Amino acid sequence: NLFVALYDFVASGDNTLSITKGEKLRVLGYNHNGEWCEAQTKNGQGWVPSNYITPVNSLEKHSWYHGPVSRNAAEYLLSSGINGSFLVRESESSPGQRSISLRYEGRVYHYRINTASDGKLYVSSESRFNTLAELVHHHSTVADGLITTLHYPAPKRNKPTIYGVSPNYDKWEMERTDITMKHKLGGGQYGEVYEGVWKKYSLTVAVKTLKEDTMEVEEFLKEAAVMKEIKHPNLVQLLGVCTREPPFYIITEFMTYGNLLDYLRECNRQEVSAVVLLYMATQISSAMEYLEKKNFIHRNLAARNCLVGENHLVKVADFGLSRLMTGDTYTAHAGAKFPIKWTAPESLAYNKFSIKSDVWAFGVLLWEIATYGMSPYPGIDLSQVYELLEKDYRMERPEGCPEKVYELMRACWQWNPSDRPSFAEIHQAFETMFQESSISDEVEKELGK
């Protein structure tokens, strides 16, 4: 029953324990939701995140084994590699089905790993092995059917998200004196949000403070309440709150690269190619699929409200969320002012919002991504937007945008909200979109034309 650490973890919450990647551990038990476990190492005993470690008898211990990663995600991971960079992944839908993804001369080759009647694994029928590791080791020395050898495991660059800072049940409150406030973020577009350092861990964070005469208190507290319940890799994560006395604080993880809109407008388009844009759009759809299933609506989905972290990780800002049984409608009080270009027709006309109006906004966000941040509805005056949309006018396909991506945009922009796809359908559509050629290849066909 031994485990090995897959990522480094530094102790700071006094009941937590520091571990080093590759070190062995004995697990004693789990916390209330299984997300943390009490472990013993040669250095001590304490709580560590459960997914930062794995059984010594598990495939995850191998640097090249990335588990449940999709074909498209694999192409993103390997976009930063070289000839011979590779990884082994498993199908999320159908467990047990694995494939090798390998980079060679700027292209990624995908190979299904076959299993014989006696359980042996192989890519080439002439070379079968008892275990996955033996198969990889064999192809690490001779290509034997593959375009080239498997030489460089794709790095696992991102530590798994930890939903909070403690293994204990509800321990959100923290000491304001342990927070050093720094400069405001976003030039004020997000309100009173500042970069800060959480001394106790010398950890950089984002802090929203309830200064007098700004946000209404009930609103601020509801936001804090909602955020305690949100747990998804692509939604900004809450780390703590200071609600014992003013100024109230909401403290979250810090996204280092700012918002997606600015990132796309200022990026190196060589580095941030179509496979990277697809990777980011997919992450956003995953976050929205979660809100959809958890009965929340966003109402402000746009690239300026998506934040970018390391290795193109993208998280949707989750301030302002509203609780709404998925299928019901939320009505805004007349007079509410909305960002017209991202607002669905039923919202513009009747102030009605639902997860379907978020689907419409996602379509506009997808167009912003595909254009590297262009302002929507170019060549059109806002006063005529609703009228034009009613006549079935929709933005034109962005230069180089693959046809299937634009069709998804058009599905999101169906006039009747019930005709639009769900976020579950949208996420699944991205994952199955380029199965017989890469997005890179499709962009080519679109341009060459």
Ligand X SMILES: Cn1c(=O)c(-c2c(Cl)cccc2Cl)cc2cnc(Nc3cccc(CO)c3)nc21
Ligand Y SMILES: CCCCCCCCCCCCCC(=O)O
- Per CB under 6 A, residues contacting ligand Y are 274, 277-278, 281, 369-370, 399-401, 405, 443, 447
Least separation in angstroms between CB 33 and ligand X: 22
Burial of 183 (0-12, 13-18, 19+ CB in 10 A): exposed
The residues, ordered by sequence, that sit 6+ positions from 85 with a Cβ below 8 Å of its Cβ are 78, 102, 103, 151, 152, 153, 154
Q: Which stretch binds ligand X (CB under 6 A): 52-60, 62-70, 126-134, 247-255?
A: 247-255
Range list of H helices, 152-272? 217-229, 260-266
Q: How far is CA 122 from CA 85, 116, 295, 362, 411, in A?
A: 19, 8, 44, 41, 41
| Binding-site member from 19, 317, 359, 433 for ligand X (CB under 6 A) | 317
Of the ranges 141-149, 240-248, 313-321, 330-338, which one interacts with ligand X (CB under 6 A)?
Answer: 313-321
190 binds, among ligand X, ligand Y, none (CB under 5 to 8 A by kind): ligand X
Task: Output helix, strand, coil percentages for the chain, rounded to the nearest 5.
Answer: 30, 25, 45
How far CA 396 is from CA of 371, 377, 403, in Å, comes to: 11, 9, 11
Q: With contacts defined by CB under 6 A, name the span among 64-72, 143-151, 251-259, 350-358 that binds ligand X.
A: 251-259
Q: Which of 67, 186, 233, 247 binds ligand X (CB under 6 A)?
A: 186
Residues within window 205-224 making contact with ligand X, judged by CB under 6 A: 206-208
Please report how close the Cβ of residue 312 comes to ligand Y at its closest, in angstroms: 12
In angstroms, give the least distance from the CB of 385 to ligand X.
Answer: 27
- Of 334 and 447, which CB lies nearer to ligand Y in the complex structure? 447
Minimum CB distance to ligand X smaller for 251 or for 364: 251
Among 446, 442, 410, which residue's Cα sits nearest to residue 426? 410
CA–centroid distance for 372 within its chain: 18
Alpha helices for 191-273 (secondary structure H): 217-229, 260-266
Asked if 259 touches ligand X (CB under 6 A), the answer is yes
Nearest distance from C-beta of residue 189 to ligand X, angstroms = 8
Q: What is the binding site for ligand X (CB under 6 A)?
A: 185-186, 190, 193, 206-208, 236, 250, 252, 254-255, 258-259, 307, 317-319
